[PDB]
Amino acid sequence: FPELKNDTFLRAAWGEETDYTPVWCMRQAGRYLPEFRETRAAQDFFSTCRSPEACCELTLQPLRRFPLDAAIIFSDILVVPQALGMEVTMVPGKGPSFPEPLREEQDLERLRDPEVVASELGYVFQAITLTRQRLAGRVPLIGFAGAPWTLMTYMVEGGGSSTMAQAKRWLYQRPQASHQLLRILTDALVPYLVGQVVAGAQALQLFESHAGHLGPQLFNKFALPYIRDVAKQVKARLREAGLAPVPMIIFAKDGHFALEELAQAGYEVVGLDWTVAPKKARECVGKTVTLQGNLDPCALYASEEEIGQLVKQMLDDFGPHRYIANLGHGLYPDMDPEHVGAFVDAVHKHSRLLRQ
Amino acid sequence: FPELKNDTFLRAAWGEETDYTPVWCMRQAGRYLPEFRETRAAQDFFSTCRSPEACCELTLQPLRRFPLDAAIIFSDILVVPQALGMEVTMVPGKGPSFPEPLREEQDLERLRDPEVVASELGYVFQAITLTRQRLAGRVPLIGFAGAPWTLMTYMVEGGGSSTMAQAKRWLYQRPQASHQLLRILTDALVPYLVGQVVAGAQALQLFESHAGHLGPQLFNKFALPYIRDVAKQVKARLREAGLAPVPMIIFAKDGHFALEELAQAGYEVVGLDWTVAPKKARECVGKTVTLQGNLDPCALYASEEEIGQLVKQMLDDFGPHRYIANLGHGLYPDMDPEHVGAFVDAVHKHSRLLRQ
Ligand SMILES: Cc1c2[nH]c(c1CCC(=O)O)Cc1[nH]c(c(CCC(=O)O)c1C)Cc1[nH]c(c(CCC(=O)O)c1C)Cc1[nH]c(c(C)c1CCC(=O)O)C2
Numbered sequence: 236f237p238e239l240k241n242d243t244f245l246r247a248a249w250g251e252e253t254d255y256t257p258v259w260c261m262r263q264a265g266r267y268l269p270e271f272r273e274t275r276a277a278q279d280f281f282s283t284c285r286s287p288e289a290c291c292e293l294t295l296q297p298l299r300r301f302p303l304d305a306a307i308i309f310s311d312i313l314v315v316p317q318a319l320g321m322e323v324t325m326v327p328g329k330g331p332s333f334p335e336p337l338r339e340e341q342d343l344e345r346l347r348d349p350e351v352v353a354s355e356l357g358y359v360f361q362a363i364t365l366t367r368q369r370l371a372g373r374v375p376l377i378g379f380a381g382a383p384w385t386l387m388t389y390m391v392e393g394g395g396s397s398t399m400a401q402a403k404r405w406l407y408q409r410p411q412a413s414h415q416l417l418r419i420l421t422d423a424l425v426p427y428l429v430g431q432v433v434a435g436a437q438a439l440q441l442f443e444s445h446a447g448h449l450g451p452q453l454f455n456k457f458a459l460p461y462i463r464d465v466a467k468q469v470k471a472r473l474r475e476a477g478l479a480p481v482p483m484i485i486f487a488k489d490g491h492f493a494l495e496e497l498a499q500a501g502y503e504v505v506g507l508d509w510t511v512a513p514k515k516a517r518e519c520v521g522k523t524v525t526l527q528g529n530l531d532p533c534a535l536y537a538s539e540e541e542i543g544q545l546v547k548q549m550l551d552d553f554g555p556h557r558y559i560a561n562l563g564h565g566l567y568p569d570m571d572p573e574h575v576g577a578f579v580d581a582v583h584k585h586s587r588l589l590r591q
Numbered sequence: 592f593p594e595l596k597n598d599t600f601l602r603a604a605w606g607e608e609t610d611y612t613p614v615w616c617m618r619q620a621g622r623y624l625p626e627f628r629e630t631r632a633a634q635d636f637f638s639t640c641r642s643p644e645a646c647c648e649l650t651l652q653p654l655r656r657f658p659l660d661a662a663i664i665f666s667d668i669l670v671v672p673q674a675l676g677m678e679v680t681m682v683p684g685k686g687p688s689f690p691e692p693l694r695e696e697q698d699l700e701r702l703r704d705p706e707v708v709a710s711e712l713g714y715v716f717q718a719i720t721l722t723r724q725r726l727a728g729r730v731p732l733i734g735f736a737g738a739p740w741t742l743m744t745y746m747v748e749g750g751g752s753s754t755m756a757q758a759k760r761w762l763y764q765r766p767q768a769s770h771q772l773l774r775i776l777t778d779a780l781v782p783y784l785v786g787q788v789v790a791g792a793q794a795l796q797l798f799e800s801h802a803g804h805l806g807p808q809l810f811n812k813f814a815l816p817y818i819r820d821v822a823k824q825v826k827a828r829l830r831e832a833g834l835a836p837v838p839m840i841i842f843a844k845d846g847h848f849a850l851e852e853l854a855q856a857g858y859e860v861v862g863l864d865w866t867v868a869p870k871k872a873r874e875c876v877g878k879t880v881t882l883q884g885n886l887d888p889c890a891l892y893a894s895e896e897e898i899g900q901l902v903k904q905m906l907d908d909f910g911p912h913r914y915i916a917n918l919g920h921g922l923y924p925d926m927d928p929e930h931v932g933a934f935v936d937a938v939h940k941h942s943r944l945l946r947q
């Protein structure tokens with residue numbers, strides 16, 4: 236692959252001093268871009284995910300507009316449950332659905348052996364290699380997957396939920412079957428993540444997007460052990476294969492209560508939502524790990540000048556060390572690309588003033 | 592297995608009132624689908640049939656496109672003569688061939704004892720169990736086999752034929768050897784069909800695709816007795832094994848002359864080709880059995896609007912009771928998947944208007 240030209244994101248993830256604060260945006264390849272919607276109109280969502288050229292184009296689109304310090308591959312967390320044998324659809328205006336969710340323990344019988352999942356996800360690896368080549372070293376490419384608990388919630392709920400009542404009912408009423416499922420997911424995730432690195436990913440982010448529904452007790456029993464196992468096993472397999480381990484990011488949305496534990500779970504970077512004050516987060520996690528985040532995505536509805544002041548304040552609170560700027564969640568479909576530009580530019584401008 | 596969610600097909604097969612007319616399509620897993628051709632490119636035809644995962648994938652493909660009310664397992668009728676010890680190939684662009692067909696009575700000596708055939712077809716049962724699990728109760732799964740006479744025609748002709756002259760020459764010149772062969776086939780078919788149900792099939796279709804070459808006299812002597820024996824013996828063995836018998840469908844293509852007899856042969860459903868007017872078929876078969884069919888597959892070359900009108904007319908002629916919609920034969924390789932979608936949608940839409 237082409238030599239990396241701008242490695243600021245990686246240096247920051249590993250905890251090194253940089254000349255400025257690197258920035259990227261969750262969902263930067265997304266519906267807020269008119270050109271995303273155009274390229275997406277040609278096929279259905281999961282079909283787009285299976286086309287290396289389409290995924291590469293979507294990944295590059297934001298970089299053509301903004302000097303972001305990282306690219307994230309276009310894919311979806313739900314490719315893993317699909318590869319395990321569950322049917323998944325994208326419903327117009329209503330998002331992902333599994334028409335036949337897991338509701339009893341016997342439903343685990345229809346899943347594939349997790350060791351065969353990476354072979355079913357060859358299309359993602361093709362997308363990653365292509366995108367890594369076409370990026371031509373401009374910035375690093377991030378691979379990703381969903382965390383075991385978050386994937387479990389989709390598999391049991393059959394889609395999004397405001398309470399995760401059915402998935403939590405599995406934790407309380409079916410604890411053994413829940414651990415069985417979480418282990419199947421972990422065992423599928425590890426070879427998939429390793430495969431993403433072999434294919435060219437230079438960093439990995441694990442999305443625990445449904446962390447906040449669990450309190451500390453359930454999170455410690457059912458989410459954390461698997462988050463830890465994913466990082467430990469990925470690094471081990473990469474070492475055994477003769478490859479350089481990559482920095483790994485854990486993002487647990489609404490996971491304020493788990494920050495201390497997440498900073499000791501074997502991830503270089505802990506991603507934060509917008510509800511945690513940066514100074515308090517720095518207290519919980521300590522001085523080694525790098526923090527990523529955490530601007531309220533809705534702040535991008537403010538004027539460009541107001542976005543600038545909000546960024547200044549955020550950066551002052553995090554400080555220049557051990558920090559990658561991002562939003563606290565993904566960009567929303569109705570946001571203005573110019574305001575996204577204003578966010579990127581302000582991070583770069585103020586972080587330089589905070590150093591020089 | 593997972594609880595069945597949409598049982599409309601089964602209720603219709605058993606003669607019960609439903610909210611709408613269920614529809615499926617012969618050869619719905621077929622070459623008209625670009626994705627079928629892709630998954631089929633990886634192996635030879637009979638090798639595909641021996642891979643449970645490949646058969647499951649092919650079975651599910653049409654369901655991802657269309658809300659069909661049944662799935663039919665991907666396999667072939669010719670697995671039975673192969674399991675009896677005959678070598679069979681799939682010839683590019685020319686279809687199935689037996690390079691050493693049965694031509695004299697002494698050729699029966701190389702066949703296996705029919706009681707061992709089900710043990711040779713374990714791969715089909717594996718495909719069925721897997722597909723039943725992965726369908727996750729969405730719709731019922733249909734198993735199938737060729738009828739004795741139709742299988743005999745392939746074994747003697749060595750492939751397709753426009754006249755069945757060699758196979759009919761056996762009926763007239765070698766009647767005893769013909770009955771011997773037909774009995775061997777029946778005795779192989781019964782344990783195979785029973786095995787398909789044990790493995791998870793929820794209905795069975797027997798394809799008498801070469802019925803029309805026989806007139807009434809030959810059909811009554813050489814095809815009908817074996818069609819009757821298959822249904823009687825399958826139901827008996829299922830009862831003896833403690834299992835629920837499934838609805839059985841007999842499809843005798845170009846079998847206009849046998850409809851009355853076929854309705855008294857122990858099958859819940861009689862499938863019809865497109866040359867029989869639905870109202871005349873209802874007259875021959877009477878008021879108990881369910882009819883399945885019968886749209887000219889070539890009608891799918893018409894525009895989507897024209898397909899809608901043809902479906903309306905077909906459904907008006909059959910009436911809402913005792914009816915499962917299908918084509919009058921399998922889908923052809925050059926048909927447009929969108930037009931197949933139009934057929935499925937029109938059945939559902941008009942059959943609801945014909946009730947409410
Ligand atoms: C709507 C939706 C999708 N996929 C998903 C949903 C939410 C369902 C719900 O809970 O109701 C599932 C999903 N996909 C992803 C997550 C992680 C947490 C989150 O960001 O919401 C989750 C929870 C990462 C992603 N999903 C996607 C990426 C790729 C990176 C990128 O596109 O920039 C990632 C990491 C791509 C994606 N995936 C989808 C779209 C529309 C896009 C484009 C981005 C946008 O406009 O939202 C479909």
Ligand SMILES: Cc1c2[nH]c(c1CCC(=O)O)Cc1[nH]c(c(CCC(=O)O)c1C)Cc1[nH]c(c(CCC(=O)O)c1C)Cc1[nH]c(c(C)c1CCC(=O)O)C2
Nearest residue numbers: 618619620621622663664665666667668686751798800921
């Ligand atoms: C070409 C052919 C095949 N197999 C056969 C032929 C015809 C030979 C001739 O008389 O010249 C033999 C066969 N296989 C089947 C039948 C029943 C009658 C008929 O449908 O023609 C017959 C007569 C059922 C089937 N054959 C198949 C199924 C599985 C159900 C499904 O695939 O949807 C069934 C019930 C699968 C099959 N089998 C084959 C293909 C290409 C496919 C995919 C479907 C397509 O594009 O045609 C090979």
